[PDB]
Amino acid sequence: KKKVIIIGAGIAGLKAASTLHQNGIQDCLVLEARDRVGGRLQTVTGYQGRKYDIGASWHHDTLTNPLFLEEAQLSLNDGRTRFVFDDDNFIYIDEERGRVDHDKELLLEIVDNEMSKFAELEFHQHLGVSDCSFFQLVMKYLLQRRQFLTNDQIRYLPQLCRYLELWHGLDWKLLSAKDTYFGHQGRNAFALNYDSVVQRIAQSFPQNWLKLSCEVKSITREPSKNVTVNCEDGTVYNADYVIITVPQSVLNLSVQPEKNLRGRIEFQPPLKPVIQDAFDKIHFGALGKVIFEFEECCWSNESSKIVTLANSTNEFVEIVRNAENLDELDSMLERETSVTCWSQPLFFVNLSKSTGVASFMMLMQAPLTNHIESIREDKERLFSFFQPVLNKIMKCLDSEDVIDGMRPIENIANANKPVLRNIIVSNWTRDPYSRGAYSACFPGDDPVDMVVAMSNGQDSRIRFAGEHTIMDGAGCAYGAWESGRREATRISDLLKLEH
Amino acid sequence: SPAKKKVIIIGAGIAGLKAASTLHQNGIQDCLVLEARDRVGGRLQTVTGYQGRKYDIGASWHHDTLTNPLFLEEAQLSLNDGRTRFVFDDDNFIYIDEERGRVDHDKELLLEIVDNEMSKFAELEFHQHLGVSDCSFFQLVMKYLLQRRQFLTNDQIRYLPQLCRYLELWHGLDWKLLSAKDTYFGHQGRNAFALNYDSVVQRIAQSFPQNWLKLSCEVKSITREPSKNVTVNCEDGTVYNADYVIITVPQSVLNLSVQPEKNLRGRIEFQPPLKPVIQDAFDKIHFGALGKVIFEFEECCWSNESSKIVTLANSTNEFVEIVRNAENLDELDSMLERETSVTCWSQPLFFVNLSKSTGVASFMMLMQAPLTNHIESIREDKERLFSFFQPVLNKIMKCLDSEDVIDGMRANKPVLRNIIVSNWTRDPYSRGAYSACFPGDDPVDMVVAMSNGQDSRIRFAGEHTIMDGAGCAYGAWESGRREATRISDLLKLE
Ligand SMILES: Cc1cc2nc3c(=O)[nH]c(=O)nc-3n(C[C@H](O)[C@H](O)[C@H](O)COP(=O)(O)OP(=O)(O)OC[C@H]3O[C@@H](n4cnc5c(N)ncnc54)[C@H](O)[C@@H]3O)c2cc1C
Ligand SMILES: Cc1cc2nc3c(=O)[nH]c(=O)nc-3n(C[C@H](O)[C@H](O)[C@H](O)COP(=O)(O)OP(=O)(O)OC[C@H]3O[C@@H](n4cnc5c(N)ncnc54)[C@H](O)[C@@H]3O)c2cc1C
């Protein structure tokens, strides 16, 4: 009945669909478990109708990002604003000291930069002589260059350098040192509606292809030459080619016990060892977001990029200055509970400077993400948890402590203080169809394995797409976008030529 | 007749000095170090100015401190003796335009950010891609502005190209004379300003026999007697015989050997003449002209926010318009040809505010070719030099919170006392600053031909003879250790 069956309506699947149609292919489906398309691309609506991407937000690597370039071309022709370049000079804030960025005496940006070259040198042409954690790597550096670092640099640099946790959605003790640093192919463009991208692509093929709320439970590959696919409601579709775009975290269920897990797909035959071993190669991080909606901007718009540093100690400096080796240090750190807003770095996007909106989009990482998404409906607790970083920010930005206005209550002498009107939090680590943000690396991981395993397919019939099945743009919206065109063309020409 | 020697080293720069040090280290004797100037150090020279203030008029920094074998050694000493030999002086750059004043870390221009994107663009352009032609740095920037114009503001298109040019002060070349392929190179970590590089020179010089050193002897020729012997002739008539010789004269001096006329100061006559691999290599690598000008002030009466300051060369909104309307690089080159004298604003200038990094109320300024040649040529006319750098000097004071500079070369106003100027381009045993690439140059040819010697006995060392640390003091050093080690080993097999 069906030529190709695309599982998942994220951008990978939506692209694969747009293409198949672009190549005259007919009778193809798109089975999406959620009741909406977009997958990890979702724009929501808050106070006074403001819109925010709770999922993906940027076009990364604008110098090579092909999806972005398509968008740029569209904007050249119709003048419609689709994105904005929000790269800015980062403001770094420490609870006690305050702003530690562009410091005439701390010069953290320079050492961080060195820190970066050091890491490159440690793994350059070595085959990864034992991979450690970003945390360990940072320690090695501090030890090896202390003779050339002041006290304040040994104390703060490691905290500032953790902003990289918000790029992987992983804390520095869980993240791989070998993958921490990666290529940044040019500036980033804040998408002004990734939902426009999702919207455009979904409307580039027969709407009657989309089947929302279709949980796919099992995929069968009868050597006969067809592929049996059964959604959850008991329906069944027969197809020649199948493009599975579910997320790595989800797919990683097909290789475990308990087939009653939400989303899990039963494969018949079972995924060859290559694929199943790929999963031991690690994956899935947990980048999260909290949107803070204020009545109006009443703070300085010096920068659109603000990062709060996790608390540090002079007791740390002393331990670096006295350790005699990695072992004595790796141990002398036996020094030392209660997670607070100052227990990890937090990345704040000041939307006022960049998009004229009085809100802040904050990014968070594991293990914090899952705990905060857990209390997403408890506005009061969320406000109490972040109130201190928020006020520290407002202070540093020539403003005042935040007033809680989420409950409809109007006052007048508060037109000079920032009034918080609402909080929106993501829910990716708890949504069964995502179970996390995107692929990431634990010390010892190796992405190539999975990319190859995935791009080589289960066979000539069962293929794969998604931010986890490609090398360029891995984990990014465009990476997923291209992986969708890939499998799509590999099946397309393989049909036009047929007959 | 000619005194016998095991090894003869030509040149007492850091290369020859280290090569000799290594030799005396591996127990070799009857060696000689022939140097044309009345001093050792070569391109490393510390001079004296107002009040006894000292400055390096040649090399100043230890580059790539994460892997600099020379630096590491220096830092090891300071770990014991506890004395200060250097100071990490990297800092956030302050960029100054004539009209607009400071343009660094500006929330609207974000120049440093687009600058970062441009180098990435350059990396994506040549890295991994074979066959791509070379072109000039200037051409590379124009191409970038062309391809990314839809994503840049008018002021970025205007100021970025001028901000990118600080790289001219890393090569000693104007962006039109500089090879795009060689413009960007890795920096293995922070830089360390040596507080007197002469202390490095001295320490190495004193690590071997004094009698080994012969200053003021200008070597004029080297000959290979096809039978384990090399003849060297100082101009003072003396003649020496050696088993080995390590030639360390600058690439620019050595270049004089492949041309007819033996009466040029520094030129060495080779018999047999240098092999064609060596000769032909001079066509694929050239020489840069980085220069220095020291501005000594009475006292420091200016802001010490940073020790790094770069004055941008003038730009015009007309340029932005041309970039906006150009159809391609072809039309842009055409429109750009929109045609008077050279001023302190005709090219970027790089100033080191020594006040902040050393406490000394002076400015160390770097310049590039062609400006360096014109400035060093009139380096004796102190009045003309002040009139030249006055507008720019003032502007700095303004941006740094102070008044115009006062000429005091004979309360809250900065008073200029002395102006020192480098002389590397006019010096016969220098003839320029250091190895550099014009578009098309393949530096590997020279490095290969050099480290493989003229033959088993005629060897070469110097900053232009090695890959890692090429053009650097520590590379010259390593090349010195290289040649000496090889020889020791050979002289060890008796
Ligand atoms: C907080 C956060 C921020 C991010 N920010 C950025 C950014 O700034 N820039 C960037 O480039 N990328 C960003 N990303 C990553 C980007 O969102 C993803 O790479 C991309 O959306 C993945 O697309 P996909 O099509 O592969 O998968 P989705 O993850 O799009 O998966 C496709 C669909 O599969 C469906 N599905 C799953 N299981 C089943 C099943 N059993 N049956 C049927 N359907 C099923 C899902 O419900 C989903 O809709 C971010 C991600 C997160 C979580
Ligand atoms: C203005 C300027 C700034 C610089 N700044 C830096 C910096 O910040 N950091 C850095 O790492 N590098 C810097 N350099 C480069 C550094 O100075 C050189 O890499 C290094 O000093 C070259 O050493 P060398 O031993 O090869 O040659 P020298 O240049 O050491 O040459 C060797 C010797 O040969 C002698 N000689 C020449 N001809 C004859 C002859 N016929 N007979 C006898 N002797 C002869 C010369 O007098 C000279 O002393 C700078 C150079 C210049 C010009």
From Swiss-Prot, chain A:
Signal peptide: none
UniProt keyword Flavoprotein, yes or no: yes
Pfam family, one: Amino_oxidase
InterPro entries the UniProt entry points to: Amino_oxidase (IPR002937), FAD/NAD-bd_sf (IPR036188), Flavin_monoamine_oxidase (IPR050281)
Protein's job: Involved in the production of beta-alanine, a precursor of pantothenic acid. Multicopy suppressor of fenpropimorph resistance.
Leftover remarks: Present with 6960 molecules/cell in log phase SD medium.
This protein's name: Polyamine oxidase FMS1
